[PDB]
Each structure stands twice: as structure tokens, then as C-alpha cells.
Structure 1
Amino acid sequence: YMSRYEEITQQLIFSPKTWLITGVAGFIGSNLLEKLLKLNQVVIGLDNFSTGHQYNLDEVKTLVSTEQWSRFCFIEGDIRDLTTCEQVMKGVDHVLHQAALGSVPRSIVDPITTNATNITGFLNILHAAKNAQVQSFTYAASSSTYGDHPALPKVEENIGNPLSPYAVTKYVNEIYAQVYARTYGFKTIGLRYFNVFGRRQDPNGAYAAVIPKWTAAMLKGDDVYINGDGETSRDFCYIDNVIQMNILSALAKDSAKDNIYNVAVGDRTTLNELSGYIYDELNLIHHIKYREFRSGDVRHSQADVTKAIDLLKYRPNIKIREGLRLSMPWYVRFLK
């Protein structure tokens, strides 16, 4: 049971609010959309369809009622444009900021456009929210910001040298949010996501994440490549745990704001054992090569989620094996 999360969702159903989700047509954003509409929230969505898709919006339309879909206003637009940010902020109570161009290799190859979307666009959105006096502000940050700190598990207070432009941009979101608390009284929550996965995570394109990438390949019968020796390890985190942490953050008591939380489950899986689990799960639904290390890439990752457990009553419920089992049916339909 996710008991605090249950309570807060009950509050929201009784007294519905207006939410802004940026990055709404993406993986996490469209999952957030799905959950908030199922709670009868009024949602304003902003996306530029850079890495996101019209079809993710279509899918969510089919998963919620007509009345629930009638409360969603989608705005095609770009967080880089301050005017657009100010416009979509109007009457908003809660901000969930997911719009960014992710990927560590992407930041290395084009630190410029990435800087514009992940720093300028984050600040545009943070400033507009402040000026609009929204009730809350929760933004996607990154475990990549631990960088080369060798300690396991990772605790929020202790970060190393950033190994990529992506690590920098997400770090800078954190520092702007802390300064906004200091200088305007404007209190936010940054969510350091660790390797999120699940439905509507894009399997296609040069930057696809390992889980949908591999699922896609295992299904096609293609080669499954491993960047390095496969001992590189991660805390894979099923999207529902992320959806919990956003909603808990949006309604956090004030003393729990102006903080950073790890968002994960606390487990460590190497690339090797994941190759296993994925094959296993897909094969129950009836259907290997080493290359060099990926540069900028973090070696090992396991979160410590005590802080979120403590301060927000976060209850991570779905672990890597069940999450894969929950996701593979989606990948089949989508890729059939």
C-alpha cells in the first residue's frame, strides 16, 4: 500500500486543482498526464514534440473518460520562449516540469541546444511560476549529478564532479531552485530520477534508453549491444514510483519543500543481469555483444531513498522485475 499517496490523491479528487505539465507528450510527462486526468484534475500541457509524440497524447486519450479528457488543454509550444511559459502559467496551482532534452551522449554532442532547453527553458518556467504565484513547483532532476562521487548508495547531500553537460544542466536547475527559495521565498522540489522505465518510453532513435532499446532489439531478433563490460550498474525505477513522487511533492508540507530527493527504489542491477531479466519476461510472452564504454557515462548507481521515505512518506512499490513484467505487454503492442 502507498498510504500517504492514497490520502493525497483523495484530497485532490475532492478539491481538484489546475496542474501544468511541461514535457507532457513525453514518457514521464504523458504518464503524469494519465494519472492526473484519472483524478479529475484540470491539466494544462506544454510540449514542442521534439523528443515527445502526438501519439503519446492519443494513447492517454483512450485511457481516460471523455469528461476527464475534456479537462486537458494541450498547448504546442516551447519552454525557451518566456511569453509561452507565462501564458500557460495562468491560473495554475501546481507545476510539474519535465520538459528537457535528456541523454548524456546527446549533451556531449550538442551542449548548445541542450543548454538552451535544460537551463534557459527551466529558468523561464521557474520564473513564470514564481510570478504567477503557483502553490507548488516540482521539477525533474538527475542522478547523473552525483557524477564521479564513488560512494554507494548515493545520498542527496553528497555529489562529485559532473561527467557530462547533461549533469551540469540538471545540477544548475537545482542551484537556481535553491536560489529562488533564498531570494524570493519561492520553495520547490527537485526530483533526482534514477533510470526510469515503463510504458511510453521511446524505443526508437539514436538516444533510446537501454530498456526500451533492448526490448525492441530482442523482439526484432537483432543484436543486443553492451557499452563496456556490462558491470556498469543502475537503480532502475518503474514510472509509477516517479508518478507517486511527483504528486507527493506537489502537495508536500512546506518544511519538506526547498529540497532535493532521490527517486528510485534502492536496488542495484548490472547491465548483464538486466539482459537476463528482459529476455526472461518477453520469452514468457512467447517470441549479446560487447563494445567500448560510453563516454561521460556514470559507472555504478544505487540510490538511498531514506530521505523521501522520511520526509514525504514515499513508499516505493514496484521493483525492477515486476516493472519489466508490467512493461513488456506494452512494448509488444506498440512494436507489433
Structure 2
Amino acid sequence: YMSRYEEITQQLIFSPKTWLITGVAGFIGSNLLEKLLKLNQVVIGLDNFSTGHQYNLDEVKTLVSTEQWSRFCFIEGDIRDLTTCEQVMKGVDHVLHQAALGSVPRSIVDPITTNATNITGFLNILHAAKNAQVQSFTYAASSSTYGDHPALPKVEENIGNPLSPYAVTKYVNEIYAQVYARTYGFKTIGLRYFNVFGRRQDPNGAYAAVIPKWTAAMLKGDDVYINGDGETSRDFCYIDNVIQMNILSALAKDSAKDNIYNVAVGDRTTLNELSGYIYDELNLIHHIKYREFRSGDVRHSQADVTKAIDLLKYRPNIKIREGLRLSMPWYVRFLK
């Protein structure tokens, strides 16, 4: 039972709000779209189809009723354009900012466009939200910001040195958000995601994340590569936990705002064990090589979620094995 979350959702259904989702055609964005429409919220969506896809939007349309779909206004546009940022803010209550170009490798190889997308784009959205006087503002941050801090588990208040331009951009989102609270009274929540996974995470392309990447290859009978020794470890966190945290953040009490929260489950899985896990789960629905470490890549990652548990009454319910199980059927349909 996700008790607090249950209750917040009940409020929303009775007293529906207008939400903006940037990144809405992407993985986490379209997941948020799915749930909010299912709660009868009015949603305004913004995406430029860079890493996101029209087919994410089409899938969501099939997952929700037609009255629900009718409360969704999609706007093709770019967060790098302040003007489009302000137009989409008009009448918004709740901001959920997911639009970014992710990936640590991407940032190393083009820190320029990524800076414009992830810093300039974020400030555009942040400033426009302030001027529009939204009720809340919750944005996607990153565990990569811990950097080279050696402590496990990772606690919000203790971070190291950024090890990639991607880490920098996400850290900058946090600092601008803090200064926005100091300078304007504008109180936000930043969510440091830890390896999110589930339905509609892109398996294709040179920047694919490890779970969909491997799943896709296992299905195709292709090779399953591992960047380094396989001991590199992570806190894989199924999207539903992320959707919970975004919605709790949006209706957080004021004292819980201007804070950063780890979003994860608190577990550690190595890349060796995951390789196993995905195979076992895919083999139930009836169907290995080592290379060099990825540069700018973080060694070990495990979240401490006590802070979100405490302040938001976050209840992480779906762990890695279950979440794989919920996902593999999605990837079969999608890749066939």
C-alpha cells in the first residue's frame, strides 16, 4: 500500500489541476502523462522529439479513456526558447520538468548542445514558472551528481566532484533552484533519479540505458557487452516509484519544498547479477562479453531514501526483480 500517495491522488481526482510536463514524449514524461490523465488532470505537454517519440504519445492515448485524452494539450516546441516556455506556462498549477538530453557519454561528446538543453532550457522553464506563479515545481535531477563521493549509501547532503558535464548540468539545476527559493521565495523540489527503468524506455540508439539495451539484444540473440569488470553496481528503480515521487512532490507541504530527494529503492545490483536477472525473466516468457570501462561513468550507486520516506511519506513498493517482470512483456510487444 502506498498510503500517502493514495490519499494525494484522491485529492487530485476530486479537485483536478492543470499540470505541465516537459519531456512528455520521452520515457518518464510519457509515464507521468499516463498516470495524470488517468487521474482526470488537465495536462499540457511540451516536447521537441529529440530523444522523445510521437509513438510514446500514441501508446498513452490507447491506455486512457477518450474524455481523459481530451484534457491533454500537446505542444511541439523547445525549452531553449523562452517564448514557448512562457506560452506553455499559462494557467499551469503544477510543473513537472523532465525535458533534458540525458546520458553521461552524450555530455562528454557534445557538452554544448547538452548545456543549452539542460541548463538554459531548465532556467527558461524555471523562470517562466516563477513568473506564472505556479503552485509547485518539481524537476528531474540525477544521482550522477554524487560523482566520486565514496560513501554508500548516498545521502542527499553529501556529494563529491562531478565526473561528467552531465553531472554538472544537473547539479546546476539544483543550485539555480536553491537560489530561486532564496531570491524569489520560489520553492521547488529536485528529484535525483537513480537508474530508472520500465515501459517506454528507449532500447534503440547509441545512448540506450543498460536495461532496455540488454533486453533488446537478448531477444535478438545478439551479444551482451559489459563496460569493465561487471562489478560496477546500481540502484535500479522502476518507473512507478518515480511517478509516486513526482506526484507527492507536486503536492508536498511547503516545508518539504526547497529540498532535494533521492528517488530509488535502496538496493544494490551489480551488472553481473542484472545480466542474470533479465535473462531469467525473459526466459519465463519463452525465447556475454567484457570490454573496457565507460569514461566519466560512476563506480557504485546505492540510494538512501530515508529522507523522502520521512518528509514525503514515500513508500517504494516495486523492487528490481518485480519491475523487470512488469517490463519484459512491454519490450516483447514493442521490439517484435
What is the TM-score of this pair, normalised by structure 2?
1.00
In structure 2, the partner of 1:297 is 297
In structure 2, the partner of 1:143 is 143
Query: Offset of 1:186 from its aligned partner?
Result: 0.1
Q: Structure 2 CA distance, aligned partners of 1:138 and 1:151?
A: 26
Measured against aligned partners, the alpha-carbon deviations of 1:20-74 in whole angstroms (never above 9, x if no partner) come to 0000000000000000000000000000000000000000000000000000000
Measured against aligned partners, the alpha-carbon deviations of 1:219-265 in whole angstroms (never above 9, x if no partner) come to 00000000000000000000000000000000000000000000000
Give the match's secondary structure for 2:275.
helix
Measured against aligned partners, the alpha-carbon deviations of 1:174-219 in whole angstroms (never above 9, x if no partner) come to 0000000000000000000000000000000000000000000000
Q: Structure 1 CA distance, aligned partners of 2:244 and 2:228?
A: 33
Runs of 5+ consecutive residues of structure 1 not aligned to the other structure: none
Measured against aligned partners, the alpha-carbon deviations of 1:86-131 in whole angstroms (never above 9, x if no partner) come to 0000000000000000000000000000000000000000000000
Q: Structure 2 CA distance, aligned partners of 1:58 and 1:77?
A: 18
In structure 2, the partner of 1:270 is 270
In structure 1, the partner of 2:313 is 313
User: How is 1:95-174 mapped onto 2 (pairs within 5 angstroms)?
Assistant: 95-174=95-174
Measured against aligned partners, the alpha-carbon deviations of 1:116-164 in whole angstroms (never above 9, x if no partner) come to 0000000000000000000000000000000000000000000000000
- Number of matched pairs: 336
Give the match's secondary structure for 2:265.
coil
Query: Offset of 1:311 from its aligned partner?
Result: 0.1
Give the match's secondary structure for 1:138.
strand
Q: Structure 1 CA distance, aligned partners of 2:327 and 2:271?
A: 18
Q: Structure 2 CA distance, aligned partners of 1:24 and 1:226?
A: 30
User: How is 1:16-27 mapped onto 2 (pairs within 5 angstroms)?
Assistant: 16-27=16-27
Runs of 5+ consecutive residues of structure 2 not aligned to the other structure: none
Measured against aligned partners, the alpha-carbon deviations of 1:266-289 in whole angstroms (never above 9, x if no partner) come to 000000000000000000000000
What is the TM-score of this pair, normalised by structure 1?
1.00
Q: Structure 1 CA distance, aligned partners of 2:280 and 2:123?
A: 43
In structure 1, the partner of 2:332 is 332
Q: Structure 2 CA distance, aligned partners of 1:62 and 1:312?
A: 32
Q: Structure 2 CA distance, aligned partners of 1:105 and 1:47?
A: 22
4+ long deviations beyond 6 Å: none
Query: Offset of 1:169 from its aligned partner?
Result: 0.1
Q: Structure 2 CA distance, aligned partners of 1:65 and 1:333?
A: 21
Q: Structure 1 CA distance, aligned partners of 2:84 and 2:250?
A: 22
Measured against aligned partners, the alpha-carbon deviations of 1:283-334 in whole angstroms (never above 9, x if no partner) come to 0000000000000000000000000000000000000000000000000000
Identity level (%): 100
Q: Structure 2 CA distance, aligned partners of 1:127 and 1:62?
A: 34
Q: Structure 1 CA distance, aligned partners of 2:66 and 2:250?
A: 25
